[PDB]
Symmetry: none
Subunit: 88 residues, 6 copies
């Protein structure tokens, strides 16, 4: 039901965050978003609780590799969940 | 139609602003714009009051995630929404 | 016809400058140009006086919304407006 | 015969450089190149002497509006002049 | 199969890391990823030991050419290599 | 085939490096690569000696225009020139 995000400065940290997120909780990786200036956002989906767990492990994983710029969990409607996400 | 903008440093704060703005039934998400230096702009369209309330809710939500760089509402855009916005 | 430019750091300020420019005078909005590092240029065309008045109005407006990096008017451009501007 | 370049931080300064270059000497504007981080390169073509004159006025024009990052004149072969230029 | 990454500040360092990685071990170059601010990531795949040896060799090499920002090996990735990586 | 690279801060220095490298008949310009933070990489292909001489001439010329960030020659690239380079 919720959306989880880990924004890092560096792709290596983002890949590590992504891997940790999916390994730790029952979340599905939505994808990556590059906005420039080394900023990469990793987006995940699933239960709010599992998203909170995932985002936490992903934030930790990336801090061990590089710089974490933002960490957020967005509870979302079951009707139009991935609606709010960008189209690049 | 009113134009509402919330500009943030980071995409995570932009997605958070967009979620807060889209929360009301009369506010429609136009899109995101990446301009560099980590800056992302969220643009919404709707009734003046709805847009004002939305952008305020956007900025409030965005602040807690990352840096809000700008918050603005153009109640009566002059050319047309499509013409006044970038491609 | 003259060329008017308002360059801002942030898109929100640029949309506001654009709106003020077309509202102020009989100027035609050519478009926006993103060059990176949050820099957005709003370009307008018309009579020198209209262009001068418009750029002034767009700069003043954007200034209450964000950072204005440059404000410039080219009264008599060289290779006809289309040629002098980027694709 | 030569290639002239004025690289500015800001598009407003680049448009001003471009306008000054074509107004001052017998040069032809090739175009603009955006490389990010506010960096814009204005490229001109013609006689080496006219290119030197153009680049000088363009550098001055842009310094009056914004930041000039680089100014260079490249004498080139008449066979393949614009060959060396980027394809974006 | 394991995932190996060498992130550098500069493309020249990245090409050098890539070359050293494929020369050192039985690793397959997946590709390069540009994320802005001069950051380039070189990604390889193969046996954990081969990947460890390769990343080490690519980091050492790039270091004599430019700035290495990160060096990381994921021994057992989750959503099969293609899914875990960006498009 | 040998691979030669000259990485600079600014495009003007990159065009200058490319002109100096392309000056010899056995050095072929592969292209330019923009990676962000004002960084531009010029890549050339040819005989080892020609590539070495070219990159050195590139760097020398580039220095006088802007900042040279990296200069490197890979005499014997391992995969293949097309495979070892970004898309």
């Amino acid at each position: 039901e919720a959306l989880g995000m880990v924004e890092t400065k560096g792709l290596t940290a983002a890949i590590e965050a992504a891997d940790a997120m999916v390994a730790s909780a029952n979340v599905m990786l939505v994808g990556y978003e590059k906005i420039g200036q080394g900023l990469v956002t990793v987006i995940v989906r699933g239960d709010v609780g599992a998203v909170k767990a995932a985002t936490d492990a992903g934030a930790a994983a990336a801090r061990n590799v590089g710089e974490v710029k933002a960490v957020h969990v967005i509870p979302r409607p079951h009707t139009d969940v991935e609606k709010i996400l960008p189209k690049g």
